[PDB]
């Protein structure tokens, strides 16, 4: 079949609870979006709240509190919100990349593959039904003879060393102790909601299904870029997609051959081309799904305005499905900065979005300035 990009954009925005507007729970949003980047917590709250007809940013904190959401390291090694019952397949595929097996990882971390296995085992035992800060956990570890020589390596580079453990499912965030972050065992925290982790082969079709269900149609390259910055074996990827067979449909999207779920093929073909304005927070999944690199969404000459140093992903103005500018809250005003070659933004449409963002931010009003 054929489809236009504006069809695809409209369909994606329907799947991602952007247009039309409904009132999904935080778990519904996180589940649908295949996770939400949560390194900056305020940004994760906003991106869920903006996907609710009546923005409810505290829904994230509440559902984290009642343990219907987990925080751990997943895609591309970054901190994600995930539904605990859905986390398995995602994590299994990350472990499959075996990033920590590379000599370069060993040289940087100061931890051997043998030692990663030992840490996996020991951390799982320490955190079983136990909540510890980083320092508390590291202190427990170095009491061990296998790890006493590693104390310096573990403290300074904990952020890197913990990721294989997260991917293997032996650690995740516990409840915050005041302002400090804690770690615990997923199995003990989530109980019957924590399923046994699948092998990568059985997990792959689940992850691919979930991905295409929000960010389809897409290529294999685009999928693995989102998953792991293209770290997966390419022959393995070919088999994963191939074994799904007619569960997938090939779509010619204005020249680009891509895969969509067959169950969504007819729906996509009937979707009207994307129209309208949408104001998305920073690090939004609408962008990160297909990737900021995708030139049909974001023009290459304007990419540096969105994706900046230290991995900053700006809030974006989306018009007809394409990124046409950025925005920022300054002095409790919503300041919009369109790109030079961007069409004149209808002020009333922007102001309506600002009111939606205002509610999602927990403030009464956000005056608009277009710069």
From Swiss-Prot:
Keyword DNA damage tagged: yes
Pfam family, one: AlkZ-like
EC numbers: 3.2.2.-
InterPro entries registered for this protein in UniProt: AlkZ-like
Motif residue range(s): QXQ: 37-39
Keywords: DNA damage, DNA repair, DNA-binding, Hydrolase
UniProt key word DNA damage: yes
Disruption phenotype: Essential, it cannot be deleted.
Induction: The gene is adjacent to the azinomycin B biosynthetic gene cluster.
PANTHER family, alphabetized: LMO0824 PROTEIN, WINGED HELIX DNA-BINDING DOMAIN-CONTAINING PROTEIN
Known function: DNA glycosylase involved in the repair of interstrand DNA cross-links (ICLs), which are highly toxic DNA lesions that covalently tether the opposing strands of DNA, thereby inhibiting essential cellular processes such as DNA replication and transcription. Acts by unhooking both sides of the ICLs, forming abasic (AP) sites on both strands. AlkZ specifically repairs DNA damage induced by azinomycin B (AZB), a natural product with potent antibiotic and antitumor activities that interacts covalently with duplex DNA and forms ICLs.
Similarity remark: Belongs to the DNA glycosylase AlkZ-like family.
Domain remark in the UniProt entry: Adopts a unique fold in which three tandem winged helix-turn-helix motifs scaffold a positively charged concave surface perfectly shaped for duplex DNA. The active site contains a QxQ motif and a beta-hairpin essential for base excision activity.
Listed name of the protein: Interstrand DNA cross-link repair glycosylase
């Amino acid at each position: 079949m054929k489809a236009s990009w504006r069809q695809v954009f409209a369909w994606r925005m329907q799947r991602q609870f952007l247009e039309p507007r409904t009132q999904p729970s935080a778990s519904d949003v996180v589940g649908r979006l295949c996770g939400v980047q949560a390194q900056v917590w305020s940004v994760a709250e906003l991106n869920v709240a903006l996907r609710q007809a009546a923005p409810d940013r505290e829904s994230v904190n509440r559902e984290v509190a009642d343990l219907s959401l987990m925080k751990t390291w997943a895609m591309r090694g970054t901190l994600h919100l995930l539904r605990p019952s859905e986390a398995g397949p995602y994590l299994s595929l990350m472990a499959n990349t075996g990033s920590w097996l590379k000599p370069s990882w060993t040289r940087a971390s100061g931890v051997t593959p043998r030692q990663v296995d030992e840490l996996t085992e020991e951390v799982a035992g320490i955190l079983d039904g136990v909540v510890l800060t980083r320092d508390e956990l590291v202190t427990r570890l170095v009491a061990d003879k296998r790890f006493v020589s590693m104390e310096e390596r573990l403290r300074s580079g904990w952020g890197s060393v913990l990721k294989p453990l997260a991917w293997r499912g032996v650690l995740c965030h516990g409840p915050n102790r005041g302002n400090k972050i804690t770690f615990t065992l997923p199995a003990s925290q989530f109980g019957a909601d924590w399923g046994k982790m699948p092998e990568p082969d059985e997990a792959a079709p689940t992850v691919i299904k979930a991905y295409l269900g929000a960010y389809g149609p897409a290529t294999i390259e685009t999928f693995d870029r989102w998953l792991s910055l293209n770290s997966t074996s390419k022959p393995k990827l070919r088999k994963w997609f191939g074994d799904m067979g007619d569960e997938l449909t090939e779509v010619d999207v204005e020249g680009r051959k891509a895969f969509v779920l067959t169950e969504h093929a007819e729906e996509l073909a009937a979707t009207a081309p994307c129209t309208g304005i949408r104001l998305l927070g920073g690090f939004d999944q609408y962008l990160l799904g297909p990737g900021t690199k995708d030139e049909v969404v974001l023009a290459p000459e304007h990419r540096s305005a969105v994706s900046r140093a230290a991995g900053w992903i700006s809030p974006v103005v989306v018009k007809d499905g394409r990124v046409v500018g950025v925005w920022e809250i300054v002095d409790q005003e919503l300041v919009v900065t369109p790109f030079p070659d961007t069409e004149r933004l209808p002020v009333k449409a922007v102001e309506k979005e600002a009111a939606h963002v205002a509610r999602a931010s927990g403030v009464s009003r956000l005056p608009v300035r277009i710069v």
